[PDB]
Scaffold this active site. Structure first.
Site, mmCIF file in Angstrom:
data_model
loop_
_atom_site.group_PDB
_atom_site.id
_atom_site.type_symbol
_atom_site.label_atom_id
_atom_site.label_comp_id
_atom_site.label_asym_id
_atom_site.label_seq_id
_atom_site.Cartn_x
_atom_site.Cartn_y
_atom_site.Cartn_z
ATOM 1 N N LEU A 1 0.793 -1.224 0.000
ATOM 2 C CA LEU A 1 0.000 0.000 0.000
ATOM 3 C C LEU A 1 0.837 1.293 0.000
ATOM 4 O O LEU A 1 0.366 2.304 -0.462
ATOM 5 C CB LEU A 1 -0.939 -0.004 1.210
ATOM 6 C CG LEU A 1 -1.895 -1.213 1.220
ATOM 7 C CD1 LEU A 1 -2.669 -1.194 2.506
ATOM 8 C CD2 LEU A 1 -2.835 -1.177 -0.021
ATOM 9 N N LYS B 1 10.897 5.913 3.807
ATOM 10 C CA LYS B 1 12.296 5.562 4.146
ATOM 11 C C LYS B 1 12.368 4.592 5.329
ATOM 12 O O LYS B 1 13.200 3.665 5.323
ATOM 13 C CB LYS B 1 13.137 6.808 4.484
ATOM 14 C CG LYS B 1 13.171 7.900 3.415
ATOM 15 C CD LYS B 1 13.845 7.445 2.118
ATOM 16 C CE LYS B 1 13.616 8.468 1.008
ATOM 17 N NZ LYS B 1 14.460 8.201 -0.182
ATOM 18 N N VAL C 1 6.776 0.783 5.822
ATOM 19 C CA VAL C 1 6.121 0.059 4.727
ATOM 20 C C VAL C 1 4.710 -0.256 5.178
ATOM 21 O O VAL C 1 4.496 -0.631 6.324
ATOM 22 C CB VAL C 1 6.830 -1.276 4.403
ATOM 23 C CG1 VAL C 1 6.172 -1.936 3.177
ATOM 24 C CG2 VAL C 1 8.308 -1.050 4.131
ATOM 25 N N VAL C 2 3.747 -0.130 4.284
ATOM 26 C CA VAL C 2 2.369 -0.418 4.617
ATOM 27 C C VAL C 2 1.942 -1.499 3.635
ATOM 28 O O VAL C 2 2.103 -1.333 2.407
ATOM 29 C CB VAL C 2 1.437 0.820 4.504
ATOM 30 C CG1 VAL C 2 0.040 0.492 5.024
ATOM 31 C CG2 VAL C 2 1.997 2.009 5.252
ATOM 32 N N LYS D 1 1.170 -1.455 9.116
ATOM 33 C CA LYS D 1 2.196 -0.433 8.947
ATOM 34 C C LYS D 1 3.397 -0.808 9.721
ATOM 35 O O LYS D 1 3.331 -0.900 10.955
ATOM 36 C CB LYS D 1 1.697 0.941 9.419
ATOM 37 C CG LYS D 1 2.692 2.105 9.205
ATOM 38 C CD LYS D 1 2.029 3.512 9.173
ATOM 39 C CE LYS D 1 2.232 4.323 10.416
ATOM 40 N NZ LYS D 1 1.984 5.811 10.273
ATOM 41 N N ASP E 1 1.065 17.328 8.555
ATOM 42 C CA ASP E 1 1.470 16.640 7.308
ATOM 43 C C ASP E 1 0.191 16.268 6.528
ATOM 44 O O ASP E 1 0.032 15.121 6.045
ATOM 45 C CB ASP E 1 2.343 15.408 7.672
ATOM 46 C CG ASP E 1 3.138 14.854 6.491
ATOM 47 O OD1 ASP E 1 3.474 15.595 5.535
ATOM 48 O OD2 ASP E 1 3.429 13.646 6.542
HETATM 49 C C1 LIG Z 1 -8.752 -0.141 -7.017
HETATM 50 N N1 LIG Z 1 -8.249 0.356 -5.724
HETATM 51 C C2 LIG Z 1 -7.398 1.532 -5.910
HETATM 52 C C3 LIG Z 1 -6.926 2.078 -4.564
HETATM 53 N N2 LIG Z 1 -6.251 1.032 -3.779
HETATM 54 C C4 LIG Z 1 -5.481 1.428 -2.681
HETATM 55 C C5 LIG Z 1 -4.205 1.981 -2.880
HETATM 56 C C6 LIG Z 1 -3.434 2.413 -1.811
HETATM 57 C C7 LIG Z 1 -3.940 2.281 -0.525
HETATM 58 N N3 LIG Z 1 -3.390 2.546 0.715
HETATM 59 C C8 LIG Z 1 -4.250 2.174 1.688
HETATM 60 C C9 LIG Z 1 -4.040 2.341 3.109
HETATM 61 C C10 LIG Z 1 -2.961 3.057 3.682
HETATM 62 N N4 LIG Z 1 -1.991 3.517 2.880
HETATM 63 C C11 LIG Z 1 -2.896 3.311 5.112
HETATM 64 C C12 LIG Z 1 -1.912 4.066 5.739
HETATM 65 F F1 LIG Z 1 -0.856 4.467 5.004
HETATM 66 C C13 LIG Z 1 -1.929 4.382 7.075
HETATM 67 C C14 LIG Z 1 -2.968 3.900 7.855
HETATM 68 C C15 LIG Z 1 -3.959 3.109 7.295
HETATM 69 C C16 LIG Z 1 -3.938 2.817 5.923
HETATM 70 N N5 LIG Z 1 -4.966 2.088 5.384
HETATM 71 C C17 LIG Z 1 -5.032 1.843 4.021
HETATM 72 O O1 LIG Z 1 -5.991 1.194 3.620
HETATM 73 N N6 LIG Z 1 -5.356 1.661 1.080
HETATM 74 C C18 LIG Z 1 -5.186 1.722 -0.301
HETATM 75 C C19 LIG Z 1 -5.976 1.300 -1.369
HETATM 76 C C20 LIG Z 1 -7.054 -0.190 -3.659
HETATM 77 C C21 LIG Z 1 -7.491 -0.678 -5.025
#
Ligand SMILES: CN1CCN(c2ccc3[nH]c(-c4c(N)c5c(F)cccc5[nH]c4=O)nc3c2)CC1
EC number: 2.7.11.1
Length: 293
Positions: A23, A27, A30-31, A46, A142
């Site tokens: 996701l 640096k 990683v998620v 995370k 941020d």
């Molecule tokens: C078709 N679609 C497009 C969008 N696609 C997507 C792309 C990136 C995504 N990141 C997170 C996500 C976080 N990055 C995150 C975080 F950085 C901190 C705390 C909670 C978080 N929860 C998340 O769910 N979901 C995503 C879905 C899913 C598929």
């Protein structure tokens, strides 16, 4: 040396399976998506590195979790579910937001402009979240579009603020970590080393609205030099070409936030009363001032 505090890695791997959907990557972080083996429920795991540039940063990470824990009760803030730890990492099991980043709705290459109805709703929801944070003396610091997520895209879902790693209390020092953010989203006061204010968040809300309405970053330039000049001069494209399909009230909302002097920016609470965001749902029966009596 180090004793671990949070639930064991062996328990993590017992309760969850990581998916192949990465996701985000920074640096020291990683998620990755994961699934509960028992329920099938999806989450975002995370993985935060404890060691950073020589420093033991567990205390920082603990602070970040304290903040998330305080803000859990607000549905516009991402929900923390569990915490795990191994030798190098603390792992946060966070809410999954299937829609991804609000940034995807700001991209030049997106053809569909999001409807005014939707932009209004999304901005209201972001403001509700920021209002809650500010009522509890948390400045996010941020609030880039990459740190606001959506619960879904089809249909358009709801807002979730993420990533409290830069968050501080009101009136803390603008330090080396502040002046190192993403250059195009930094407020003038941050560049000029004035102290931390709730107003910084509001500037970022100005940018989010501008980006949702124009699909252009208001301040990014030729080079970071021009970015910083654009920020410190508050040099913003309000041209009729860029704003021909943007309402005056939305223009007013953005312009009241994108001002150099943090003290002139309205609070989250005042923004919530802005005429732009006052909309009646046509499906509801309106009850006028002139009653049937
Ligand atoms: C078709 N679609 C497009 C969008 N696609 C997507 C792309 C990136 C995504 N990141 C997170 C996500 C976080 N990055 C995150 C975080 F950085 C901190 C705390 C909670 C978080 N929860 C998340 O769910 N979901 C995503 C879905 C899913 C598929």
């Amino acid at each position: 040396t180090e004793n671990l505090y949070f639930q064991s890695m062996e328990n993590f791997n017992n309760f969850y399976i990581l998916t192949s959907k990465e996701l985000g990557r920074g640096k020291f972080a990683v998620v990755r998506q994961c699934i509960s083996k028992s329920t099938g429920q999806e989450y975002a795991a995370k993985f935060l590195k404890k060691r950073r540039r020589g420093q033991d940063c567990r205390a920082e990470i603990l602070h970040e979790i304290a903040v998330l824990e305080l803000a859990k009760s607000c549905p516009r803030v991402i929900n923390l579910h569990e915490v795990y730890e191994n030798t190098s990492e603390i792992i946060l099991i966070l809410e999954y937001a299937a829609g991804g980043e609000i940034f995807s709705l700001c991209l030049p290459e997106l053809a569909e402009m999001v409807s005014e109805n939707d932009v209004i709703r999304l901005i209201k929801q972001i403001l509700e979240g920021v209002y809650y944070l500010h009522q509890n003396n948390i400045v996010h610091l941020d609030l880039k579009p990459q740190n606001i997520l959506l619960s879904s895209i089809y249909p358009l879902g709801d807002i979730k603020i993420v990533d409290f790693g830069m968050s501080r209390k009101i009136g803390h020092a603008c330090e080396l970590r502040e002046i190192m953010g993403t250059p195009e989203y930094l407020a003038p006061e941050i560049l000029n080393y004035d102290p931390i204010t709730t107003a910084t968040d509001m500037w970022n809300i100005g940018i989010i609205a501008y980006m949702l309405l124009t699909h252009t970053s208001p301040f990014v330039g030729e080079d970071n030099q021009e970015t910083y000049l654009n920020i410190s001069q508050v040099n913003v494209d309000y041209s009729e070409e860029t704003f021909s399909s943007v309402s005056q009230l939305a223009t007013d909302f953005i312009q009241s936030l994108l001002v150099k002097n943090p003290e002139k920016r309205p609070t989250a609470e005042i923004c919530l009363s802005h005429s732009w965001l006052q909309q009646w749902d046509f499906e509801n029966l309106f009850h006028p001032e002139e009653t049937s009596s």
